[PDB]
Amino acid sequence: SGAIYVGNYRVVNRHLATHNDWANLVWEDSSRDLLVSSTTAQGCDTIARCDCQTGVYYCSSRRKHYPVSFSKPSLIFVEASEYYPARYQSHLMLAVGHSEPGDCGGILRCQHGVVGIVSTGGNGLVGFADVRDLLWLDE
Ligand SMILES: NC(=O)[C@H]1CCC(=O)N([C@H]2CCCc3ccccc32)C1
Ligand SMILES: [Zn+2]
C-alpha cells in the first residue's frame, strides 16, 4: 500500500484504488497501473522533474529503504495476476531489489522529489510506475 499526495491530488496504484478514489476520479490508465483522485486537504509531496536513474525506495515487506539504479520508463511485459491479464505495462522502470505484491505503493525518490511508486516485482526485481511525465499534478 501507499500513495503520493501532491496539491489536491492523490496518486495510487490503479489496482489498489478504493471506492472513494473512483468516486473522486481525475485520471486513470490501466496500461500504467495508475489512478489519480482529488482530495480536499492539500498535499505537500514534491514530484521530481528530471531524468535521474538512481534513487531510494521504501520496501514495506522489509520495513526498509533501499538505494537503486533503475531503467528509463518503458513498455515492459508483466505476467498475469488477479488484477490484470499478462500485458505490456507502459511507463515502467525496473531495478534490482526486493518487492512482493503488498509492496505496491512504496515511493521511489531521487534528490528532486518523488519519481514513482512500486507497481511490479518478483525474482529479485522491483518495478516502479513513473509519475515524472504527469506535469499537470503541479497545477
Ligand atoms: N502492475 C501489475 O500488473 C501488478 C498487479 C498486482 C500484482 O500483484 N502484481 C504482481 C505480479 C507478480 C509479482 C509481484 C511482485 C511485486 C508486486 C506486484 C507483483 C503486478
Ligand atoms: Zn531526479
User: Ligand 1 pocket by C-beta < 6 Å: which residues?
Assistant: 15, 33, 78-79, 81, 83-84, 89, 99-101, 103-104, 119-122
Looking at the structure, tell me whether residues 69 and 29 fall in a common domain.
Answer: no
Backbone angles phi, psi at 71, to 5 degrees: -75, 165
Looking at the structure, tell me whether residues 40 and 72 fall in a common domain.
Answer: no
Q: Mapping DSSP to helix (H, G, I), strand (E, B) and coil, where does residue 112 land?
A: coil
- Resolution in A, one decimal? 1.3
Looking at the structure, tell me whether residues 40 and 74 fall in a common domain.
Answer: no
Looking at the structure, tell me whether residues 50 and 109 fall in a common domain.
Answer: yes
Looking at the structure, tell me whether residues 18 and 36 fall in a common domain.
Answer: yes
Helices marked H in 14-133 — which ranges? Answer: 19-23
**By residue range, what is the domain housing residue 12?**
3-44
Number of domains in the chain: 2
Approach to solving: X-ray
- CA-CA distance, 6 to 123, in Å (whole number)? 32
From 100, 120, 128, give the residue whose CB has the most ligand 1 atoms within 8 Å, as the site to mutate.
Answer: 120
Looking at the structure, tell me whether residues 14 and 61 fall in a common domain.
Answer: no
Contact between residue 103 and residue 64 where contact means Cβ atoms under 8 Å apart: no
The answer to whether the annotation marks 112 as part of a ligand binding site is yes
- CA-CA distance, 64 to 32, in Å (whole number)? 25
Looking at the structure, tell me whether residues 90 and 117 fall in a common domain.
Answer: yes
Looking at the structure, tell me whether residues 56 and 31 fall in a common domain.
Answer: no
- CA-CA distance, 73 to 24, in Å (whole number)? 27
Q: Summarize the chain as % helix, strand, coil (round to 5).
A: 15, 55, 35
Active-site residues: which are they?
15, 33, 104
- Measured between alpha carbons, how far is residue 49 from residues 28, 101, 131, 132, 135 in Å? 20, 27, 9, 6, 8
The grid coordinates listed for 136 are 499537470
- CA-CA distance, 45 to 64, in Å (whole number)? 20
